[PDB]
Amino acid sequence: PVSNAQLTQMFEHVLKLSRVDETQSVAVLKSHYSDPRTVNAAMEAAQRLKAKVYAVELPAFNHPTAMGNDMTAYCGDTALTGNLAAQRALEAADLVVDTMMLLHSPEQEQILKTGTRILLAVEPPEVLARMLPTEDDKRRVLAAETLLKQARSLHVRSKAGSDFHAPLGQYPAVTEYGYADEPGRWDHWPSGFLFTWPNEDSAEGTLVLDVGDIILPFKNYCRERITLEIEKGFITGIHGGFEAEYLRDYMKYFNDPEVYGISHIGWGLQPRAQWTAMGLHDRNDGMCMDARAFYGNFLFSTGPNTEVGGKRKTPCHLDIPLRNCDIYLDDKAVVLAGDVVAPEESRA
Amino acid sequence: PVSNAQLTQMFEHVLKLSRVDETQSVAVLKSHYSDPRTVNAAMEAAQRLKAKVYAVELPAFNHPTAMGNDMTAYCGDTALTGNLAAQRALEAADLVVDTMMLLHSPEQEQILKTGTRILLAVEPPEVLARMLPTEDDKRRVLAAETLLKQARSLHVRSKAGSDFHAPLGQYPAVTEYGYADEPGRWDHWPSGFLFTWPNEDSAEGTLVLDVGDIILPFKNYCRERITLEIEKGFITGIHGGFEAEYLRDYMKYFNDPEVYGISHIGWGLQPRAQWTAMGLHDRNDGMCMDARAFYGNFLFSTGPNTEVGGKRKTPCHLDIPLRNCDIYLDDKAVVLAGDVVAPEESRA
Amino acid sequence: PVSNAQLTQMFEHVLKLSRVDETQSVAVLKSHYSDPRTVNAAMEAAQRLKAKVYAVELPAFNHPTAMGNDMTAYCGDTALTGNLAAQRALEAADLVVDTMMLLHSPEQEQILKTGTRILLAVEPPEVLARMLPTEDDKRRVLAAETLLKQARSLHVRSKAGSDFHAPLGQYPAVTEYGYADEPGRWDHWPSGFLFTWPNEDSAEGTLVLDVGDIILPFKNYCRERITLEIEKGFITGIHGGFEAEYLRDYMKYFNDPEVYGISHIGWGLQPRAQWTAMGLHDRNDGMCMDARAFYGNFLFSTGPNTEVGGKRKTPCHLDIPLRNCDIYLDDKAVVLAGDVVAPEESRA
Amino acid sequence: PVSNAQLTQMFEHVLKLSRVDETQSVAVLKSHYSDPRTVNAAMEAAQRLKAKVYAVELPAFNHPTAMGNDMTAYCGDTALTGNLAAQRALEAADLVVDTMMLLHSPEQEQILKTGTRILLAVEPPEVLARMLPTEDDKRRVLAAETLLKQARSLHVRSKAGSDFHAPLGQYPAVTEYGYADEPGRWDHWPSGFLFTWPNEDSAEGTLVLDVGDIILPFKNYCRERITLEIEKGFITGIHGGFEAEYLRDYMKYFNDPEVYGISHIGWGLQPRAQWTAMGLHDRNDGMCMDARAFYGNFLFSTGPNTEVGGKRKTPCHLDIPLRNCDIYLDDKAVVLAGDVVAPEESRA
Amino acid sequence: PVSNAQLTQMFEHVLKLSRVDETQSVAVLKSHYSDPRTVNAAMEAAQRLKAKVYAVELPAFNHPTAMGNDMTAYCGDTALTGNLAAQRALEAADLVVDTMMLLHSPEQEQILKTGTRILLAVEPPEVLARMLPTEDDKRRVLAAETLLKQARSLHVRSKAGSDFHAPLGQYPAVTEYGYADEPGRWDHWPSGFLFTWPNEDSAEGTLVLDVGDIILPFKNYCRERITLEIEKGFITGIHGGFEAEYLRDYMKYFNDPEVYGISHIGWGLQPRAQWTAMGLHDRNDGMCMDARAFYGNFLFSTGPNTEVGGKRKTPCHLDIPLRNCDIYLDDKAVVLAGDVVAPEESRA
Numbered sequence A, B, C, D, E: 001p002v003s004n005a006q007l008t009q010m011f012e013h014v015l016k017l018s019r020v021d022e023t024q025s026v027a028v029l030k031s032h033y034s035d036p037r038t039v040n041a042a043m044e045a046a047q048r049l050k051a052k053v054y055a056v057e058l059p060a061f062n063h064p065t066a067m068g069n070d071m072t073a074y075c076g077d078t079a080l081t082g083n084l085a086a087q088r089a090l091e092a093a094d095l096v097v098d099t100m101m102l103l104h105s106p107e108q109e110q111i112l113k114t115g116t117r118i119l120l121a122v123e124p125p126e127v128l129a130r131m132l133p134t135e136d137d138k139r140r141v142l143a144a145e146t147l148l149k150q151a152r153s154l155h156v157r158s159k160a161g162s163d164f165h166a167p168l169g170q171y172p173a174v175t176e177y178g179y180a181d182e183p184g185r186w187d188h189w190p191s192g193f194l195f196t197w198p199n200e201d202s203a204e205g206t207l208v209l210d211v212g213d214i215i216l217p218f219k220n221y222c223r224e225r226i227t228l229e230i231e232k233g234f235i236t237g238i239h240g241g242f243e244a245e246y247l248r249d250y251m252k253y254f255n256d257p258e259v260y261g262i263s264h265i266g267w268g269l270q271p272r273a274q275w276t277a278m279g280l281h282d283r284n285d286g287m288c289m290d291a292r293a294f295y296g297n298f299l300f301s302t303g304p305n306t307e308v309g310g311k312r313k314t315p316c317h318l319d320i321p322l323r324n325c326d327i328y329l330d331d332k333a334v335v336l337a338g339d340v341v342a343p344e345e346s347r348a
């Protein structure tokens, strides 16, 4: 496990990648459920770097109908909703270290528009250490982003039956390489992947969760196939066995035809993340960045897309990584058999 | 002692009086030595009144030459010094509950300029409860403020031989009545007194700390007399037995002529405070507002007066109340033999 | 200092002397200011002795006019006042270990009348170790109780000028030897002393606090004499220096003629208690049993006497032990020059 | 659940069995993630038994590539690696109570070589209570050991297709009956099993994880068979469905030919342990001793064997218990179809 | 006050000066009453410096007849008495940080002989910060040592009547400058003074505690004179008013002629320490090193000399600083009227 001393050094390293120094101000955002060791370590490390530091504690926000303890599960209001003073208290800072899992909101977007950069850190210390950010990871992620911002279409195929096409261009590319160096940037330690959104009402085809593919926030390896039929950017059929029914039942509870929209789409670039990791953790350890980010996955998502000016504001939200896919941007393959093949600069 | 329910209720009471309601944002300012029960009662109470809330934690500021644990003793920089983001974090709020004892500073003056209010609350709960603030305390204190602002001169006599003159006018009256209701106001729960400052280089005569008179932050009842000789606003001679030598040596330590300057002067109007209270407490219990505010005391101060655009910025600061004094504003007496006599409204 | 293991062992010892075993039920009474180590040790110890145990936590009770943190200083309502259910929950136990300092009250007296026995234990572990109860202390105390119950009068002389006479007979003798073995008995770990009360309206003479004598809760060694003139069981004069005036001032604040009545009178039998102990502690640490029980002191008290059916229910309460006294019961001396001389079985 | 009282009494029981008394010294070894309750109980029980005690605290060691929070998952360096002084601090003691799970390493082996004995205690209190050690467990486990030390080979068959042969003799037999009574002896509260290692480069045949069989540290009951093919001490083939792919992925990650080596082999003799227990626990709750020690299991392990001078020093370590097995020493059955049949004195 | 951050940084400074780096082992010694912030800060700082570290926790040891919570007040056995394993646990290390105040004893001396060095650090962080150790301080203190090791006699005179003489030479001089750089060396952060002991049975004359002088551990400033008459290295008479009677009573209580022995003698060389500091603190804040080390004091002690193989191992230990003294080595002044005059290289 990770000692207190190692944990402050890790924060020293990541904050330094994030351009924290004596000119900079750091605000550590926490609530009752924040990991006190991580908060502590972020406060000490920041002070070691000569930054001006303060913590901001907000009362937790609860969505009454939300289930489980993964907060990515229900995308709605946040602790900042209606608390304009606290938001200003965070805008005042250059860098916010977020340990309370503030969700994407117009309130957060307003923080980012002032130049403030935000670094999310909520995984346990041990996950943090295995996926400790590097500049190499930034270069690789950015090489891939260049290639994605020039793409007009995205195609996914798998031997299991995925055949999925997504026109692009209408929306930007997002990257997460694990540190918050550039102003107005949000990032997450740990990460190491990229995505965009399909043009509105256009994503078509079928996506097949094979045996061994994952649905978050359920955090299970599927034991039977689920076939998703998608038309004009919405899931219209969900088929297969017990997982299929559990999925169908879970999406129905939200009682909203918006849950079925396809939101982000992208691939993983983090070789230190492992598909097997999730099997060694409890549900309540964290949100499982290993599943999201592992090298050569295809990650797609359902539900809200308000983050980029999409129509959908629904709380239901799934992230589903697929193994063993072939992924194509226009004519060219970025991933083949779940091995990353292009750009050459993006490869491990 | 004071339970958690009673503490919360007392903070509801004082925050009501400080005009906290649903239109308001409260910031609870704290550091690692803040009492957690007090912080939690303030946060809970503010939410009961439907105000938005957040807590602000700052790292402790240490002045390396300072002695004791009393923070009034050493007036220098503070954790706000060069820490604008932190200051903006407080400025966001309508009302700051200070549980860390931020000392008067240009940075704090800026906060009040914006219209933000500051309530200091750091004494132990039992003390807080005994001097719970009232609208009647404000009335009486504000009645005294009227008289004081007109006054051209202050004069103090005692049978023990105090004979002290101070010319007024050049500097404002300042009140403390225990709550922060007006915009840009600072007050301290608990309090109930007022002071001003004498004209530059002008104060003249002798002050005698009789047997039983008090020096803060030493927190001793004097057992022998201390005679202080004052020329052109400065102490030039300190005479007596052991307390005098103890006092001279304390002042010498600071190695600075600024320490001998007289700062605020004024009288106490808090009948629920008690001169005997100090001898039932330890030093580190707090700063002993009972000695400062007890009804009919004369309280004068030394050292820094940059608070009001004075020349002196030195850390060394004593507050000294005296019993059994007659105090005269111009020709008219406020206190006679330690009893408040004028204004009538201001009496108990 | 005392380790956790040694503290549980000490409690095992005292609870064994208090006749705790597998037939008995023990309730540990605590509130938020209770020493958690002592509570934990009481709970562990009782369970080691196979007793059935539980803890009762009450919300603290504050007297709004009370000053300081010692609770013997203000005798009025308690946490049990108005809380019949909690009282009953205490009544169910055979033995209550009180770690919250429940003052004597009608509710407590009712707990005692059900057979329930109560042991107070609030002093720090180190004082508790030093004055760990023995059977031999009980023997010595009871032998003095035998003598005191036959007494028709008590007389106190001292070279410093004490000359005090009190008829007895009207009221019982109370003993404290530091454990709670008999049903319906209250006792206090640590102690080792006994007292009674003088017949109503009858105590006459002078008691002189010599240099070095103590007033509780002030917890000072007197540096100047205070002379107490007493007539028909009331102090009618208090003369001397600063201590005199401080005492006069303190008693006045209560605005109650009753504070000046003489309540209990007795002597100490605890050689392991030391008159010097007090100047090695802080006011916060405890209520100072060393001062009340030290061998050969004459201890007297002012204020309430509703404990024994007296007229006075006032909150002001002093305990004042005097060194170097001769104490006579009828014509027979029990203490001479602060040394215990009779009964022979009560001596060290 | 288990109280503090009970937990301490369990440590007394176990420490006594482990021959702790007034002649002995106990070091309680710990880190930031140790259960403080277990620590305190070990400390206090050691003092109740009159031993001299201290605790040693090491800062935690993280293997940057390790996953999950079970420390049996990565057997590499430990917090003792290069910390010679800490090693000597543990060598000073007669008995180390290990509450941090010190992996078997050259440093621990050395400690044991000084005569120091070590008792591992890291399972949750309830698990500790369910498998509280007995002298009778020791007898049954020693009776089995006799037969193991007499064997020239070990053979496992099962209806599912296990057909596995292991020449014995090169390496010694090791027992675990739950307490550390003998000098230089390491044991684990709880346990109740025994094992040895096969001769170098010799183990042959196949081992079949049937439905219901367990891989540690994954902590799953397999839903599909996995077949392990073994040649000359090494797994050379892993076949089945999803469990098999996952397993293969996990072993490959470590990128070491060494992970594939068969290490210890043996059977379970703890009837208080239970194959079903694991499905009643979360992954972070413990290491799952139930799964390792249950009566009649066959337990084999992969990876490192430097414990006993074997060539392999790798981190990847699996323990795999198999149900329903026929286990033979030479030609003689010690277990048939998961029931223990010989020796008779080893049986329930 | 001092933040965690700052406190960690101070320990780096101090441990660097104590020559801690990658080659060294640091052991941090503690007990249940050790300040955890200080413990953490020391553990952290030694890691930041690449040292190997562990903590050793000893259960607290309590001398049943000890009074108060200053541990210098009773120098008998310690928590290491009889605990050889723990002593070895500490000898294993190159540098021990003592956060529990191991008293001087045959065990602590033995540790030091193995070449292990020791740094005591128990004063509150704020104090630690005010007298932060410097190389210059060492320079000044070794200069004074030079002088003292040459001296054949020490003589103290004061206007108040001190007239005291002590042959030197039988025993070594000892320095304390704040850091433990040399192997075999004990020091204390904070300090800055030096002392030796007088030849057996030889110190003669009178030492007068004037008004303003201090007795440790009573931690009072004397209000009346106490006169100590000294013959053949023992106090034979103690005279004055109330303080003298108190002191006599305190000494008698231990019932041991060895308490009256004159032990170390010397003077203070620390200008950042202040004679007034003590009056700003509470008894349980620390041991008042300000009072022991202030520049120009003469400090003498009573009770045990066993540390140097002296005859007396009694627990009653007093430390007594006098101001305004002339101190002479042979016939030359090192101090006059409480100001240090030789050697010139020791002056501030």
Ligand SMILES: [Fe+2]
Pocket: A263, A264, A301, A302, A317, A318, A319
């Ligand atoms: Fe998503």
Ligand SMILES: [Fe+2]
Pocket: B263, B264, B301, B302, B317, B318, B319
């Ligand atoms: Fe002031």
Ligand SMILES: [Fe+2]
Pocket: C263, C264, C301, C302, C317, C318, C319
């Ligand atoms: Fe009383």
Ligand SMILES: [Fe+2]
Pocket: D264, D301, D317, D318, D319
């Ligand atoms: Fe294993």
Ligand SMILES: [Fe+2]
Pocket: E263, E264, E300, E301, E302, E317, E318, E319
């Ligand atoms: Fe000493």
